[PDB]
GROMACS .gro file of C-alpha atoms in nm:
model
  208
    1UNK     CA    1  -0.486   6.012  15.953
    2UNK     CA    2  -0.600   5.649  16.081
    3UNK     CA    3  -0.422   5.463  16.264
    4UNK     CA    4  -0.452   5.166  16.049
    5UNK     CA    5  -0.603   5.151  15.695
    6UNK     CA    6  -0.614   4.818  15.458
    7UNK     CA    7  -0.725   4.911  15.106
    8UNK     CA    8  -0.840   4.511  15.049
    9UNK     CA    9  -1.105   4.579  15.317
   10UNK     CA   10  -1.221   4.879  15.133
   11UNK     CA   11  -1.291   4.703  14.773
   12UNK     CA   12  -0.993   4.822  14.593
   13UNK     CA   13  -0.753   4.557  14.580
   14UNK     CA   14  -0.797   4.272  14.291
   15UNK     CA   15  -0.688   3.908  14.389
   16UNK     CA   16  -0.306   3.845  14.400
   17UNK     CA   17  -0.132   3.770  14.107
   18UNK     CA   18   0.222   3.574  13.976
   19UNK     CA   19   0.496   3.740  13.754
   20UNK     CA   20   0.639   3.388  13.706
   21UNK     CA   21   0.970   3.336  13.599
   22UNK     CA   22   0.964   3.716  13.444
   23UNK     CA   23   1.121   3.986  13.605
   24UNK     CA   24   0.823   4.195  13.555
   25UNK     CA   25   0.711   4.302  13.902
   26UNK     CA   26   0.774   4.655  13.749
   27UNK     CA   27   0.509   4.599  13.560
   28UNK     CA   28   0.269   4.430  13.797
   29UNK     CA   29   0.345   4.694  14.113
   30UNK     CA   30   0.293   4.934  13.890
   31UNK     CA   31  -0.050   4.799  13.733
   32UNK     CA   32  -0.184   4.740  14.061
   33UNK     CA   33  -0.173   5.105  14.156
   34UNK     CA   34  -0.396   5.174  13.875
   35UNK     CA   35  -0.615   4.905  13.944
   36UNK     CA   36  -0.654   5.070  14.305
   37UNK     CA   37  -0.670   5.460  14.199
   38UNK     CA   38  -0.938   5.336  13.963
   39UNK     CA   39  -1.163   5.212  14.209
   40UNK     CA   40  -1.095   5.463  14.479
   41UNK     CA   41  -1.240   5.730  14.180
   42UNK     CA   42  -1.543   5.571  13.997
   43UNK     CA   43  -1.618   5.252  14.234
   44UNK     CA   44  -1.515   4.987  13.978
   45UNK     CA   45  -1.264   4.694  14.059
   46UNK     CA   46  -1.110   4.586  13.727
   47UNK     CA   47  -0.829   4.391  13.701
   48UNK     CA   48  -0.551   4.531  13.453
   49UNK     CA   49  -0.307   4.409  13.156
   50UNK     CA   50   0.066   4.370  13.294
   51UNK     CA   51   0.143   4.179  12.941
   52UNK     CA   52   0.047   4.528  12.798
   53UNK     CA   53   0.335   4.686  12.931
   54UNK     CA   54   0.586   4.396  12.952
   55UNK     CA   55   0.556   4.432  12.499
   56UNK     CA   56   0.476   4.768  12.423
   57UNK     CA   57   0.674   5.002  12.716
   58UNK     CA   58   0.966   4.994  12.522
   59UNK     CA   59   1.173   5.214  12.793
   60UNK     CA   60   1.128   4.957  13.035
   61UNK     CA   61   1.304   4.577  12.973
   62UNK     CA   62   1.025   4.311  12.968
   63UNK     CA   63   1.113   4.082  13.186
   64UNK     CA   64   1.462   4.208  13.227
   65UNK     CA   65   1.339   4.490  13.394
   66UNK     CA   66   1.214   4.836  13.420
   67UNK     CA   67   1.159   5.139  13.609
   68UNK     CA   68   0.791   5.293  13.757
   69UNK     CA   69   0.804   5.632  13.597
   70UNK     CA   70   0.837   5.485  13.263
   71UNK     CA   71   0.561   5.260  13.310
   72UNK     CA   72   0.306   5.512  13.482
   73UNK     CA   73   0.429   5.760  13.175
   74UNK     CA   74   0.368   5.488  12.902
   75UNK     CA   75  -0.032   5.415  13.091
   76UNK     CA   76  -0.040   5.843  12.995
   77UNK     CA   77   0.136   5.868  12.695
   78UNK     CA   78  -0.066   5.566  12.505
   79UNK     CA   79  -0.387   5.680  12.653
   80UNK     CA   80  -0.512   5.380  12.867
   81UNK     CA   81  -0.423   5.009  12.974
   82UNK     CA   82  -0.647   4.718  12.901
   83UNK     CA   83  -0.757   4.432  13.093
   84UNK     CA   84  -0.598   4.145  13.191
   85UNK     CA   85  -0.892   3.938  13.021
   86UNK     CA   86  -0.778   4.090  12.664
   87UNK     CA   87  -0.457   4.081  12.699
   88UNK     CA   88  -0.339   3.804  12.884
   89UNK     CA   89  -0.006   3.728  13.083
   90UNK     CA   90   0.236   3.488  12.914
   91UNK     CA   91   0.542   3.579  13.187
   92UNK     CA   92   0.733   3.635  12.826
   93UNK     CA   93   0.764   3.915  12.602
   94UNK     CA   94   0.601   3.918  12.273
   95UNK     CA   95   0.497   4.165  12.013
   96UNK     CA   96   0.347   4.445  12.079
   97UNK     CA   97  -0.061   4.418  12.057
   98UNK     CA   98  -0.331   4.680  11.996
   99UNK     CA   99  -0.556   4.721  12.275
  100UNK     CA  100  -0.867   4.877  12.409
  101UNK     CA  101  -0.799   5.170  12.648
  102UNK     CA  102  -1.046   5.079  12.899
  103UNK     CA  103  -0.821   5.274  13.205
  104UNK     CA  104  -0.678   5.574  13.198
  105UNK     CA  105  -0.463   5.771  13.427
  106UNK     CA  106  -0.387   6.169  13.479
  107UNK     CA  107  -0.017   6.140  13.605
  108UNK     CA  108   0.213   6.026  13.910
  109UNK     CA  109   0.336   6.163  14.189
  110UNK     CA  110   0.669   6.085  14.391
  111UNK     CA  111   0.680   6.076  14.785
  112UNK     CA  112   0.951   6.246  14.941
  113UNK     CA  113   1.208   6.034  15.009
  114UNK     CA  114   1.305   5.820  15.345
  115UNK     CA  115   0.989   5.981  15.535
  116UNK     CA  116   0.770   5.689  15.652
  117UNK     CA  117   0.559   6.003  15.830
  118UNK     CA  118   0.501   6.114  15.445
  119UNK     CA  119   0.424   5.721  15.297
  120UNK     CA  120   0.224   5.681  15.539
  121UNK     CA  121  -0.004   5.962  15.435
  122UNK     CA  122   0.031   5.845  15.100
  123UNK     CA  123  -0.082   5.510  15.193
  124UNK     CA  124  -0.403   5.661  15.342
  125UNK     CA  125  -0.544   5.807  14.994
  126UNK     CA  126  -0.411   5.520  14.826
  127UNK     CA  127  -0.131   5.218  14.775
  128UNK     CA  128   0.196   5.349  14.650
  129UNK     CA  129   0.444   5.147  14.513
  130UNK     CA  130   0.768   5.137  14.630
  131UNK     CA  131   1.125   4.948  14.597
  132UNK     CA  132   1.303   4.690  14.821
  133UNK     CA  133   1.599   4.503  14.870
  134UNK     CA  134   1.466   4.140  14.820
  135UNK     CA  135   1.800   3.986  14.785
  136UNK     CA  136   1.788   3.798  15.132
  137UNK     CA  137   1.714   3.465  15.190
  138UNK     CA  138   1.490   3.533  15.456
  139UNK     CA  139   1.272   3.762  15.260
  140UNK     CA  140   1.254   3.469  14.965
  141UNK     CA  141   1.159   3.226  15.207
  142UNK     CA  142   0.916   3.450  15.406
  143UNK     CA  143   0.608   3.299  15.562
  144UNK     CA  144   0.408   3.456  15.812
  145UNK     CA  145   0.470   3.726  16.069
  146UNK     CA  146   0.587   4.052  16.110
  147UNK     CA  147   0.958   4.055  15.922
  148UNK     CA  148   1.155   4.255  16.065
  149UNK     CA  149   1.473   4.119  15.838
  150UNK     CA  150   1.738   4.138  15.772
  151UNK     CA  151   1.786   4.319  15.442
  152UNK     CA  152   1.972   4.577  15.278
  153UNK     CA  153   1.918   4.835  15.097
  154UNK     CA  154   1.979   4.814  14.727
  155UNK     CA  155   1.691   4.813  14.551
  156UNK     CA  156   1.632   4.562  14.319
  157UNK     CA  157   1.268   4.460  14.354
  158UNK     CA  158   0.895   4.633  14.340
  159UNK     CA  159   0.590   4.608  14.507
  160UNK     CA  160   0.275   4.773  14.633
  161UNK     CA  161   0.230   4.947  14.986
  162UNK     CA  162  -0.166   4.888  15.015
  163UNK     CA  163  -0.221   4.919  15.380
  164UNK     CA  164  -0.075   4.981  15.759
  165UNK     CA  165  -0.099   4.934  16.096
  166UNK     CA  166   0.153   5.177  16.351
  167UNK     CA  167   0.416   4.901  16.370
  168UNK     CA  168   0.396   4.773  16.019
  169UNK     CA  169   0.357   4.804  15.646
  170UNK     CA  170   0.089   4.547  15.469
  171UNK     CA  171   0.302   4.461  15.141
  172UNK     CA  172   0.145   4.288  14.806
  173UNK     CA  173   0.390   4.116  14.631
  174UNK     CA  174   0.354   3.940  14.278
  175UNK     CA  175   0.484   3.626  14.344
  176UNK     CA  176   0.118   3.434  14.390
  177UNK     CA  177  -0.022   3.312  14.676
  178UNK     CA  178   0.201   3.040  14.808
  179UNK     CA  179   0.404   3.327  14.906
  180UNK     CA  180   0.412   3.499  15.187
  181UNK     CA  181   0.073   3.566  15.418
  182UNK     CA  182  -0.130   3.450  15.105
  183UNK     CA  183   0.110   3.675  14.874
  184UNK     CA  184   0.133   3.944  15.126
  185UNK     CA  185   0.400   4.055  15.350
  186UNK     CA  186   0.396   4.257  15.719
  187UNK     CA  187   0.716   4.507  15.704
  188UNK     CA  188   0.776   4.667  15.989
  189UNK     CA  189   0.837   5.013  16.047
  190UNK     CA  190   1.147   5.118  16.121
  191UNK     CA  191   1.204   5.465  16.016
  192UNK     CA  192   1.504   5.590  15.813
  193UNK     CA  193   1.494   5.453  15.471
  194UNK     CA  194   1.241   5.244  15.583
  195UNK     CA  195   1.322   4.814  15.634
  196UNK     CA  196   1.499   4.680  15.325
  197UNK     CA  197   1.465   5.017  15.191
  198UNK     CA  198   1.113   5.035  15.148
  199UNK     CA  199   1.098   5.424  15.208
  200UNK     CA  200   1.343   5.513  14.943
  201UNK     CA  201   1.150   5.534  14.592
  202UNK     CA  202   0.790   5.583  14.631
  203UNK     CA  203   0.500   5.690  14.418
  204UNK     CA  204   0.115   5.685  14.337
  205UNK     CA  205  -0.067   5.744  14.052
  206UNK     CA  206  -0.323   6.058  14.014
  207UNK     CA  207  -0.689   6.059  13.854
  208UNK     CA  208  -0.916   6.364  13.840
   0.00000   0.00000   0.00000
């Protein structure tokens, strides 16, 4: 495996985006895995509809909420995700629109659990998303450098794992780019359950 990998460098990361004051980041951690996996497979960078799944995945809670294997199964299920260009983000729910299947994915897979050794390879095919514990100040407030915490580790908050370095995890988080390293966050690695928790739930989408 590299050492260090960063999937922006390799053309398969679209520009960051903002959730707003909608607790979607289900939705857009989620979305940006397919954006990646898409890219990775046929060489085309297309950015994808989170306002898709924050009105029609009706398992998950719009912006109250929601869980990644209901929206990876809802991408299956209905057959494809459009773009964000047709079906664009409002940061509130609204009815349910018809729209173009433009991606599609095969299925998801789930990393075993608190095993950065086993993320890490993940990482290397492609970003994974994962859950943290954002709940501390010092993560809101976050700026530059390698965090190191503290956190705990309820999670409560998701994001996409889309590159790494040996002491550190290169985080894309949904809150714009005033945020953050330009919307980005260094984690470090700290074994375990991972910092803040980061090594507890993840997962990656699959493509033929």
């Amino acid at each position: 495996l590299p050492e260090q990998i960063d999937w922006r460098k390799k053309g398969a990361v679209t520009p960051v985006k903002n959730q707003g004051s909608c607790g979607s980041c289900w939705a857009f951690s989620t979305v940006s895995t397919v954006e990646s996996i898409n890219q990775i497979r046929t060489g085309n960078l297309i950015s994808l509809s989170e306002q898709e799944l924050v009105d029609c995945d009706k398992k998950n809670h719009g912006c109250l909420g929601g869980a990644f294997v209901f929206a990876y199964q809802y991408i299956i299920n209905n057959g494809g995700i459009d773009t964000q260009a047709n079906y664009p983000y409002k940061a509130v729910q609204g009815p349910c629109q018809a729209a173009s299947k433009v991606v599609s994915i095969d299925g998801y897979n789930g990393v075993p659990f608190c095993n950065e050794x086993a993320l890490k390879q993940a990482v290397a095919v492609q970003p994974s998303t994962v859950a943290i514990d954002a709940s501390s100040a010092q993560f809101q407030q976050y700026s530059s450098g390698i965090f190191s915490g503290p956190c705990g580790t309820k999670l409560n908050h998701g994001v996409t794992i889309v590159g790494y370095q040996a002491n550190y995890w290169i985080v894309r988080n949904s809150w714009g780019r005033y945020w953050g390293e330009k919307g980005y966050i260094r984690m470090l690695r700290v074994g375990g359950c991972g910092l803040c928790g980061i090594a507890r739930l993840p997962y990656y989408p699959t493509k033929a």
